[PDB]
């Protein structure tokens with residue numbers, strides 16, 4: 001019989017054996033395993049998405065994007081196991097490099113030194129430069145999506161919500177206000193939130209719902225200038241902000257009194273309220289805080305950026321399942 005972990009069968013043998021639990025979520029379950037061909041330990045995740053269209057979209061995006069991307073700071077896909085026919089296919093096993101932990105877990109137990117924060121931040125931005133150069137928005141950057149190895153190498157994961165550019169605590173204010181016209185800047189906001197969390201071991205902008213989160217945001221950043229209000233397309237968003245009481249900016253060094261001054265200048269530029277004024281990834285990399293690492297010769301871009309929206313939103317789940325079957329065929333044998 002097949003190996004089982006926490007009640008889930010992982011039917012990945014004979015090539016992959018010695019299954020051990022790592023974690024789980026709505027997506028399914030991830031385990032470590034041993035690859036008896038390549039003689040290496042790997043991560044394997046079991047996804048079972050075919051009952052719902054949304055799950056199938058997230059699965060197809062993950063697979064398509066990660067097979068197209070190739071970057072040191074982005075997790076790849078090494079192999080995919082699924083059934084030999086569409087009708088038999090209920091589970092999809094995605095095989096990826098094994099890392100040691102993720103930043104969510106790390107921050108639960110460890111206080112990071114500036115040297116660690118600086119290197120992690122560098123790598124996040126270096127991977128994000130590639131993502132953005134592919135004309136893609138990640139849209140769900142957060143500490144659990146940052147995988148780490150023993151020498152502090154970092155890889156971004158989870159492209160299930162990514163889109164071609166046309167927990168809620170890491171979401172940019174423009175999304176919450178429904179300001180319309182979202183850009184790459186949404187991911188920079190998320191990185192700002194991750195940096196603040198590396199500096200303090202807790203989230204900078206928690207909140208019950210968007211109204212609460214926005215009040216916390218503006219309680220720290222202070223009220224948007226009229227000029228920033230005038231840059232909002234959505235009149236409903238502008239009007240909502242004009243309805244709030246005036247708040248002064250809280251200095252960053254109040255909240256993070258032991259943080260590097262350069263780190264706080266970059267934090268301020270990332271956690272800028274107006275998305276048009278928010279620092280872009282290439283300028284972030286060039287910021288003084290990251291001078292120890294910055295090297296444009298070693299910060300590659302995507303060879304062939306995505307041109308067009310993937311257009312998955314109104315495909316039935318059964319058609320998405322066929323597209324998943326087709327995408328996963330490159331890991332099946334040829335004649």
Ligand SMILES: O=C(Nc1ccc2n[nH]c(-c3ccncc3)c2c1)[C@@H]1CCN(CC(=O)N2CCN(c3ccc(-c4ncccn4)cc3)CC2)C1
Nearest residue numbers: 026027043049055058059062097098099100101157158160
């Ligand atoms: O890639 C992911 N995790 C990885 C990967 C490689 C790793 N190597 N080492 C580790 C590691 C981590 C922590 N500690 C030690 C080691 C890895 C973790 C995460 C896990 C899931 N993944 C996204 C993903 O697989 N997709 C996007 C979401 N999607 C999806 C979402 C929901 C549902 C769903 N299904 C049933 C009910 C409800 N929802 C189905 C599919 C499936 C495709 C991002």
